[PDB]
């Protein structure tokens, strides 16, 4: 007799079959008064239009935020955010910072430990002393 | 021919005169390779540092670009599908599939010139309420 | 007021409507991003992708909601996943087959798929919310999608007096996963186990309606490709869905049915007998052929584990990792169809 | 329209006259400059507040 | 092109018939043992690639199954397998500070390092049919 | 299945698709897995039957006076408002077909 377990579900592998960019929204805040936003205002007029036209899967929201530095706040599918203050940055520095939020995921930064990350079982199995030619001391 | 000279050991604790011999050969760091013609003025330069370098007779001289390409490993990958992107200086480059090869880059001052879907392109799509998939396809 | 003019212009009757108007979908940046995030064909307008986000709990009209779109998509998802399991694992027991389907096209995975797309929900539905948000009211469970199951005349006794329900009948009476059929407002409260089921249900109907939208606009092949890209692409270990009862008897009944020699358990290796953590490696043979093997810290457990692994090997037989599906013949220009392997049925033992 | 003596001294052609009379003051706010742009207001995935 | 050996043309179908397969790809000479569906986090920022780009990997030293193992002398012939990856994005580490200091000297020099890493997803790893070659 | 149906299925499959799990304690195979797939197929063909049905009825009037999107592709799906597959795939109807074709004598 075989009883079925109904607590296990399938897991998604973003990239296999279909790809989905993790960055889903980009909040672009500026200031018409703060001098630290002179570069941000230029990024919104010179480079943001073409950058947004090339990333139609991201939602761009340009809203003023007077009395505050300019920030680039990205929202990710995992539910986290990443805000980068771009005060006193030139337009091309803003673009390089915006491409960082696009290419990035919401996951927290982690030190480099292992290149490969796998969930499927070993093709050759795991070693066992009871499945070889034995060992004589 | 030429002398292919490579610095194998260092001269840290060696006399100052030995450092000048290596400076005149052009050897500034370990395993650095230089090429010099086969002449007495260079042979005697090597007899002073023969305990530090490795010499070899070669027909021709290798260029700085050709000497560094013999240690370059194979990339191991080939970009066959590039998604739409925006190059700051050129413009917006449309998606290209090198597997079937067409990198067309469109620049302009209006959205229609960039080669992307605009709010107007979405409104005409919504008004085409008559188009219908063929019954066979369905 | 004068200092805070409205950001998105809306008529005064906006809040009165249950869902935003269709034309409003043409001014939402969330929709346009969602449409491109899924690489949907331009044949699917934004007004249609907006209709896939309105649950019947937010708009009771047969139109403007997910009811019909989700039903068509559910039939496509369930069909493509069913034929795919019977061609990859033609020996799966019926119970394991129901769980495998529910593990791919059930409310749990579809909830994860909808979240994998970056679809946020609206707090309370209304004509003022962004058309790019999933609209539903978790306080109203009186909405149910049409299915192909029937209500059992003994359902009242099934739940109260623990009456018996067989597996052979779940294919005709119960739903596609074996589940029986038919199993002012104040927001000063907390969640409930019912609101979670209503929310999980809303996300599922959305993913289904997207498939139904692709089918209505693009066609049949486009729908199969979408299902095959976001659903069948997921990973599931079916071996972990097995729960055996007396596996030593089921294996003896299997060998008897196929006319194999009676199964005999043999000790292939052992170490640590008379210790706290021994290792007995037992292998079950039918004559001279090794069927299964299991290693445990007890002689009985090692014998049961060996029989379970022998039964899994029988049920998890796969002709191939990417086998042909009978749906491939509908696509014109396909090679002739080769008959697939049809199993007799799971073993029934004492 | 009152034209400053600095504007008149710069005006040296009939085209400079029409320009100083027709071109309105440049909008100081960035949002006003954006709504006059030709790309950002047309992209479907962009919204400016 | 150099024809495949008869010993490989005879056993490759037996290699591709087994359930699971792994491969050891080489990116810039460094090996990575991966399988279909695995995620690779390279210790460097690959230039000229954005999330969504598809790469074709063509330097495999080992392509094997449980029992059989195909070995190439420098590498395996590209005609025997098809491995493809997709760029998932770019990750970063937390800023780490290295303090360079000697005893009995107050000057503590700081070194701030925050490196970026490109992430790939192996979305295809299949062995081709060589009955034609 | 009309003339030529006897040869359509294999010899062992003709008896399997016809045997129920209540026969001989399932010692000989039964048709529980084939029925699971057969329902998914009839459920899909019955749905396609309504979508492509060239029949149009009076639309629904919105209490709020709204007007639907009114797309043609969505008109085929709106046909499910009036005709549901379960209305056609009734147990009594399908069960009656088998009795007429003599399914009760060979099952
Ligand atoms: Mg010194």
Swiss-Prot record, chain A:
SMART domains assigned to the protein according to its UniProt record, in alphabetical order: L51_S25_CI-B8
Keyword tags: Mitochondrion, Ribonucleoprotein, Ribosomal protein
Keyword Ribosomal protein among record annotations: yes
Keyword Ribonucleoprotein attached: yes
Gene Ontology BP term (one): mitochondrial translation
Molecular function per GO: structural constituent of ribosome
GO cellular component terms, semicolon-separated: mitochondrial large ribosomal subunit
Location in the cell: Mitochondrion
Signal peptide: none
Coiled-coil spans in chain: none
Functional summary from the UniProt entry: Component of the mitochondrial ribosome (mitoribosome), a dedicated translation machinery responsible for the synthesis of mitochondrial genome-encoded proteins, including at least some of the essential transmembrane subunits of the mitochondrial respiratory chain. The mitoribosomes are attached to the mitochondrial inner membrane and translation products are cotranslationally integrated into the membrane.
Quaternary structure note: Component of the mitochondrial large ribosomal subunit (mt-LSU). Mature N.crassa 74S mitochondrial ribosomes consist of a small (37S) and a large (54S) subunit. The 37S small subunit contains a 16S ribosomal RNA (16S mt-rRNA) and 32 different proteins. The 54S large subunit contains a 23S rRNA (23S mt-rRNA) and 42 different proteins.
Family note: Belongs to the mitochondrion-specific ribosomal protein mL43 family.
Protein name: Large ribosomal subunit protein mL43
Native source species: Neurospora crassa (strain ATCC 24698 / 74-OR23-1A / CBS 708.71 / DSM 1257 / FGSC 987)
UniProtKB/Swiss-Prot annotation, chain C:
Organism phylogeny: Eukaryota, Fungi, Dikarya, Ascomycota, Pezizomycotina
Keywords per UniProt: Mitochondrion, Ribonucleoprotein, Ribosomal protein, RNA-binding
Gene3D superfamilies given in the database record: 3.30.160.20, Ribonuclease III domain
PANTHER family (UniProt xref): LARGE RIBOSOMAL SUBUNIT PROTEIN ML44, RIBONUCLEASE III
Known role: Component of the mitochondrial ribosome (mitoribosome), a dedicated translation machinery responsible for the synthesis of mitochondrial genome-encoded proteins, including at least some of the essential transmembrane subunits of the mitochondrial respiratory chain. The mitoribosomes are attached to the mitochondrial inner membrane and translation products are cotranslationally integrated into the membrane.
Biological-process GO terms, alphabetical: RNA processing
UniProt gene name: mrpl3
Recorded superkingdom: Eukaryota
Protein name (Swiss-Prot/TrEMBL): Large ribosomal subunit protein mL44
Localisation: Mitochondrion
Entry's family note: Belongs to the ribonuclease III family. Mitochondrion-specific ribosomal protein mL44 subfamily.
This protein's record includes keyword Nucleus: no
GO cellular component, one term: ribonucleoprotein complex
PROSITE patterns, alphabetized: RNASE_3_2
Pfam families registered for this protein in UniProt: dsrm (PF00035)
GO molecular function: double-stranded RNA binding; ribonuclease III activity; structural constituent of ribosome
UniProtKB/Swiss-Prot annotation, chain D:
Cellular localization per UniProt: Mitochondrion
Highest taxon listed in the record's lineage: Eukaryota
Family: Belongs to the mitochondrion-specific ribosomal protein mL50 family.
Subunit structure: Component of the mitochondrial large ribosomal subunit (mt-LSU). Mature N.crassa 74S mitochondrial ribosomes consist of a small (37S) and a large (54S) subunit. The 37S small subunit contains a 16S ribosomal RNA (16S mt-rRNA) and 32 different proteins. The 54S large subunit contains a 23S rRNA (23S mt-rRNA) and 42 different proteins.
Full-protein positions shown: 346 to 394 of 443
Gene: mrpl13
Disulphide bonds in the chain: none
Transmembrane annotation, as ranges: none
Role summary: Component of the mitochondrial ribosome (mitoribosome), a dedicated translation machinery responsible for the synthesis of mitochondrial genome-encoded proteins, including at least some of the essential transmembrane subunits of the mitochondrial respiratory chain. The mitoribosomes are attached to the mitochondrial inner membrane and translation products are cotranslationally integrated into the membrane.
Protein name, UniProt field: Large ribosomal subunit protein mL50
Swiss-Prot record, chain F:
Coiled coil: none
Subcellular location: Mitochondrion
Family: Belongs to the ribonuclease III family. Mitochondrion-specific ribosomal protein mL57 subfamily.
Subunit structure of this chain's protein: Component of the mitochondrial large ribosomal subunit (mt-LSU). Mature N.crassa 74S mitochondrial ribosomes consist of a small (37S) and a large (54S) subunit. The 37S small subunit contains a 16S ribosomal RNA (16S mt-rRNA) and 32 different proteins. The 54S large subunit contains a 23S rRNA (23S mt-rRNA) and 42 different proteins. mL57 forms a heterodimer with mL44 and stabilizes rRNA expansion segments 1/2 at a membrane-facing protuberance close to the point of attachment of the ribosome to the translocon in the membrane.
Protein purpose: Component of the mitochondrial ribosome (mitoribosome), a dedicated translation machinery responsible for the synthesis of mitochondrial genome-encoded proteins, including at least some of the essential transmembrane subunits of the mitochondrial respiratory chain. The mitoribosomes are attached to the mitochondrial inner membrane and translation products are cotranslationally integrated into the membrane.
Protein known as: Large ribosomal subunit protein mL57
Shown chain mapped onto the complete sequence: 108 to 214 of 267
